[PDB]
Amino acid sequence: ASLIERQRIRLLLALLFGACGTLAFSPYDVWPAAIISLMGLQALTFNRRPLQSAAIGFCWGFGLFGSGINWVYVSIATFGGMPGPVNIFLVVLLAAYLSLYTGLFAGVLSRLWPKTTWLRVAIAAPALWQVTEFLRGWVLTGFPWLQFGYSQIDGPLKGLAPIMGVEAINFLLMMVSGLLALALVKRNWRPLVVAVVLFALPFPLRYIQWFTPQPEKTIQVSMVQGDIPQSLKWDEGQLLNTLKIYYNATAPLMGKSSLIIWPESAITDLEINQQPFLKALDGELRDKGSSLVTGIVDARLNKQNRYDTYNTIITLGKGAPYSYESADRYNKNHLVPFGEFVPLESSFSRGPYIQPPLSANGIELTAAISYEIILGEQVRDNFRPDTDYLLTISNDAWFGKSIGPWQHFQMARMRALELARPLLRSTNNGITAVIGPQGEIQAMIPQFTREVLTTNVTPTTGLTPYARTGNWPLWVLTALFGFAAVLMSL
Numbered sequence: 001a002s003l004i005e006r007q008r009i010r011l012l013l014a015l016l017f018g019a020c021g022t023l024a025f026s027p028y029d030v031w032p033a034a035i036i037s038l039m040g041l042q043a044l045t046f047n048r049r050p051l052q053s054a055a056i057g058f059c060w061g062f063g064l065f066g067s068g069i070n071w072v073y074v075s076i077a078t079f080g081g082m083p084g085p086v087n088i089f090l091v092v093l094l095a096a097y098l099s100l101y102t103g104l105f106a107g108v109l110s111r112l113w114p115k116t117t118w119l120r121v122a123i124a125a126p127a128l129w130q131v132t133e134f135l136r137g138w139v140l141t142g143f144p145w146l147q148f149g150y151s152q153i154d155g156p157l158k159g160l161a162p163i164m165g166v167e168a169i170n171f172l173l174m175m176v177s178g179l180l181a182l183a184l185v186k187r188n189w190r191p192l193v194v195a196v197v198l199f200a201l202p203f204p205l206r207y208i209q210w211f212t213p214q215p216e217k218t219i220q221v222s223m224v225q226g227d228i229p230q231s232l233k234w235d236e237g238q239l240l241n242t243l244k245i246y247y248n249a250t251a252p253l254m255g256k257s258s259l260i261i262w263p264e265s266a267i268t269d270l271e272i273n274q275q276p277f278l279k280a281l282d283g284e285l286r287d288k289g290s291s292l293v294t295g296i297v298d299a300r301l302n303k304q305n306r307y308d309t310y311n312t313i314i315t316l317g318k319g320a321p322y323s324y325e326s327a328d329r330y331n332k333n334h335l336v337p338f339g340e341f342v343p344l345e346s347s348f349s350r351g352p353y354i355q356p357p358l359s360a361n362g363i364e365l366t367a368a369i370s371y372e373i374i375l376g377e378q379v380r381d382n383f384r385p386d387t388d389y390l391l392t393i394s395n396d397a398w399f400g401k402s403i404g405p406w407q408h409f410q411m412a413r414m415r416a417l418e419l420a421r422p423l424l425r426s427t428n429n430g431i432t433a434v435i436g437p438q439g440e441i442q443a444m445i446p447q448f449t450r451e452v453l454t455t456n457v458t459p460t461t462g463l464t465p466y467a468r469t470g471n472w473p474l475w476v477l478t479a480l481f482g483f484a485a486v487l488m489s490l
């Protein structure tokens with residue numbers, strides 16, 4: 001009974017509608033919850049003053065991020081080792097910082113398009129949501145966690161991703177959710193019909209196969225989930241058992257699996273420190289028909305008498321003879337704030353933004369370390385037409401035993417769909433899996449086990465429209481909409 005037009009009631013409902021958006025992502029996977037969450041954001045800001053709207057947008061974000069990324073508590077607790085209330089204080093600060101961008105979006109949309117109208121809801125909102133979400137993923141190196149439409153990896157809109165990227169699905173979901181909110185508030189059937197047509201049109205695109213599989217190039221791949229406990233991983237006494245654990249798991253696979261993979265920083269020692277182990281392993285792998293890629297840390301002495309420490313992937317074995325001077329390697333480019341460096345200016349150095357694909361046993365792998373797999377444009381920029389598989393290695397203990405590793409895993413799936421390549425995901429303990437060229441999960445082992453995933457995987461060829469272009473077609477769309485919306489407010 002009309003309680004909705006009290007500002008404090010709008011703030012509370014925004015928290016609920018924002019929290020509802022968390023159900024859209026893995027492991028919950030209720031993709032309609034993304035539309036309901038966006039409907040609340042669009043509707044709760046109708047007929048509000050700009051700062052009233054910004055507060056509602058902030059509270060929507062606080063429910064979304066407060067419920068969606070509170071697993072970073074485990075990251076902070078594992079990193080800092082401080083009492084609980086201290087880590088809660090930092091988590092609330094994180095969710096509050098990210099909610100500035102959802103409040104930015106609501107405040108500006110209310111300031112420039114105050115009226116409840118199709119223009120505000122279907123033209124201005126998706127274009128401005130694209131800008132404010134870019135800023136969230138760019139400012140201070142950014143944190144673009146939780147974009148709806150990553151929830152469409154198994155949904156009716158998935159065919160959009162190979163054409164224009166996952167951000168196109170962010171764009172369309174906001175558009176459709178606005179017109180549903182518009183139809184509800186104005187009690188009008190026309191915006192609902194347009195919303196249904198807009199939602200339904202991209203459905204036949206999921207029956208498009210942009211890739212060409214190569215069945216006779218199929219190889220057996222093994223991914224060693226060593227499951228080193230995080231409290232022990234970097235202890236100096238653990239190093240010798242870690243190398244034992246991984247070598248013993250790999251020995252029965254040599255000569256059977258063409259490609260063997262160890263996860264991020266599996267060898268918890270400097271690369272210069274392990275030349276005896278690496279050289280011996282390389283020869284045994286070459287003598288059998290096998291190849292190995294593994295994570296490690298590299299403190300490399302540079303031209304100016306100093307060491308740049310990297311989070312790196314190295315290659316060994318058949319078709320990739322190991323050498324400390326070999327260019328057949330990958331250095332992490334996008335480091336994690338506080339975890340791997342500090343925003344001010346022992347830290348990690350960054351590899352180049354674009355690095356060549358890894359080569360191993362005649363296989364070409366486009367690599368990204370952990371978090372980097374969510375950087376869709378960056379993964380696309382490193383992709384090459386001759387890339388056979390996408391590769392990501394990660395240590396998802398930093399994501400908790402919670403929803404964290406599943407949200408990370410979900411977004412890695414989008415890379416395979418966007419580029420029409422199989423994705424090899426090797427992790428220390430959290431969701432090791434092979435993803436097919438359409439985002440489907442071909443093989444997977446349970447978390448928190450010490451075992452290896454061995455299966456057949458088939459490489460693909462072909463270029464999706466998104467692999468050809470990248471983000472610029474969507475950007476010219478938000479520019480055309482932004483130009484039109486700004487002029488329409490004449």
Ligand SMILES: CCCCCCCC/C=C/CCCCCCCC(=O)OC[C@@H](O)CO
Nearest residue numbers: 118119122123179188190191192193194195
């Ligand atoms: C003529 C050439 C155009 C080239 C550019 C085209 C770019 C794509 C444009 C798509 C626009 C989609 C707009 C969708 C707009 C929906 C408006 C609506 O539902 O209004 C309901 C009210 O009327 C009820 O009273």
Ligand SMILES: CCCCCCCC/C=C/CCCCCCCC(=O)OC[C@@H](O)CO
Nearest residue numbers: 127128131377469470471472475478479482
């Ligand atoms: C605050 C005022 C009102 C704003 C309304 C929304 C305006 C949106 C317009 C933005 C224009 C930005 C144009 C930026 C164009 C850059 C193109 C680009 O970066 O392409 C991607 C590359 O990776 C290549 O693939």
Ligand SMILES: CCCCCCCC/C=C/CCCCCCCC(=O)OC[C@H](O)CO
Nearest residue numbers: 072075140142143336337343370371395398
């Ligand atoms: C003082 C200035 C403050 C600037 C603040 C910048 C805002 C963005 C911060 C995001 C932190 C996100 C932390 C999320 C934890 C991810 C950890 C991770 O991905 O690590 C996996 C892998 O093991 C590692 O290589």
Ligand SMILES: CCCCCCCC/C=C\CCCCCCCC(=O)OC[C@H](O)CO
Nearest residue numbers: 075076079090093094097336338339340398
């Ligand atoms: C308002 C400004 C923005 C708000 C800022 C407040 C948030 C700070 C919270 C946690 C920092 C601790 C980060 C811990 C990151 C996880 C550790 C990690 O990822 O380690 C990587 C690995 O150890 C090496 O490869």
Ligand SMILES: CCCCCCCCCCCCCCCC(=O)O
Nearest residue numbers: 019020022023030032033067068403
């Ligand atoms: C179609 C579903 C509609 C559901 C509407 C009510 C949503 C309430 C649930 C909010 C999400 C809470 C998730 C908490 C998980 C977490 O914080 O770890």
Ligand SMILES: CCCCCCCCCCCCCCCC(=O)O
Nearest residue numbers: 130131132134135138471472475482
């Ligand atoms: C702040 C005053 C101008 C505001 C104009 C709004 C549109 C420009 C805002 C900057 C975001 C554009 C970033 C593009 C980056 C890229 O395309 O890769």
Ligand SMILES: [Cl-]
Nearest residue numbers: 233264265395
């Ligand atoms: Cl680690």
Ligand SMILES: [Mg+2]
Nearest residue numbers: 364384386387
């Ligand atoms: Mg080539």
